[PDB]
Amino acid sequence: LKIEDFELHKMLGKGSFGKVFLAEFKKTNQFFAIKALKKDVVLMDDDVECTMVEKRVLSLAWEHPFLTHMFCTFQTKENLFFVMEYLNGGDLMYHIQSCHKFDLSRATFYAAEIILGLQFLHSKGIVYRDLKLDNILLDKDGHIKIADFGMCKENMLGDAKTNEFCGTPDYIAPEILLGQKYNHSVDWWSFGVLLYEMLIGQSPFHGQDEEELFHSIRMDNPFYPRWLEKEAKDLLVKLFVREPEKRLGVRGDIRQHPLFREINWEELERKEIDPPFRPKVKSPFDCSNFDKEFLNEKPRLSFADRALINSMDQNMFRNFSFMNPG
Ligand SMILES: CN(C)C[C@@H]1CC[N+]2=C(C1)/C(=C1/C(=O)NC(=O)/C1=C1\C=[N+](C)c3ccccc31)c1ccccc12
């Protein structure tokens, strides 16, 4: 379409995902989140293939309820734009800061929806690789939304393996740290780290610097507090198996774990289960549920290196455009 069809109200955030704005369709008064990338910055960072994978993965996302939905993708001479579902309900990291840890039934419900979201991605041959509490958003009813598909690997059906060193320090799998070829097993390790943090309110591994933390991930036994529910410990013990082919999620059937005894997986995937908690949100402009760091910055697209833009190959971002049905 055209970015002029939108009024950019706020910068929600800025970072490894580029820039994301609170945007209103002029015109209809519907609010969206818009991820904006500079094409010259993408080429400098050597991230052209990254951008295309993210767009292709986001193209599939409307098929599942627990992934952030993308409505459309379009480009300018300088810019790439992704028009997304707007979620101001807050991320799980932000929410956990207030309460320290989630109660067992709340953590169990988030774990179960994340399982459904991850298993959907793996069935499409996608390894997600960036699972973390910051990437889990709440919709207005309190169901989860997995966000940020910028680290995904795309052709991972059956026996397929990859090699890249990708992740966030606390959540990175030991097989990545040992330089091994890996599959979706790494997502189930990160899932364990995320579950552990929800239940306990600390990371399972520790170190004063990245190096000591990597050693902890490879060597240490996570601490399980005396009060922790038996089945919750048992699930964690089964995900924190360092041999990938023996980890729950890769082997066995994680849905059948006694922790999820009371989960009807069919009803959950249809959103027929009452969320344990619902964010309080007065309007699209209510920013009570997320980090306010960038909200007073002018909601502007910054200047590009005109020289690089007018000289670069223009067809690197072809097949970028996409329209979600209706
Ligand atoms: C920063 N983090 C805790 C998250 C993830 C940070 C990752 N991320 C979020 C998420 C995110 C979304 C989204 O899909 N729908 C959103 O409303 C949205 C938000 C909302 N908020 C309020 C927001 C702040 C900064 C950046 C992005 C976003 C998004 C879109 C494209 C690429 C990466 C993201």
Curated annotation (Swiss-Prot):
Tissue specificity remark: Expressed in skeletal muscle, T-cells, megakaryoblastic cells and platelets.
Sequence ranges assigned to domain Protein kinase in this UniProt record: 6-260
Modification Phosphothreonine occurs at: E164
Protein residues bound to ATP: L12, G13, K14, G15, S16, F17, G18, K19, V20, K35
Cell location: Cytoplasm; Cell membrane
Resulting phenotype, K35 to A/E: Loss of kinase activity
Active-site residues from the entry: D130
Subunit-structure text: Part of a lipid raft complex composed at least of BCL10, CARD11, MALT1 and IKBKB. Interacts with GLRX3 (via N-terminus). Interacts with ECT2. Interacts with CCDC88A/GIV; the interaction leads to phosphorylation of CCDC88A and inhibition of its guanine nucleotide exchange factor activity. Interacts with PRKCH upstream open reading frame 2; the interaction leads to inhibition of kinase activity. Interacts with CD28.
Written domain comment of the UniProt record: The C1 domain, containing the phorbol ester/DAG-type region 1 (C1A) and 2 (C1B), is the diacylglycerol sensor and the C2 domain is a non-calcium binding domain.
Family note: Belongs to the protein kinase superfamily. AGC Ser/Thr protein kinase family. PKC subfamily.
Function per UniProt: Calcium-independent, phospholipid- and diacylglycerol (DAG)-dependent serine/threonine-protein kinase that mediates non-redundant functions in T-cell receptor (TCR) signaling, including T-cells activation, proliferation, differentiation and survival, by mediating activation of multiple transcription factors such as NF-kappa-B, JUN, NFATC1 and NFATC2. In TCR-CD3/CD28-co-stimulated T-cells, is required for the activation of NF-kappa-B and JUN, which in turn are essential for IL2 production, and participates in the calcium-dependent NFATC1 and NFATC2 transactivation.
The protein, known as: Protein kinase C theta type
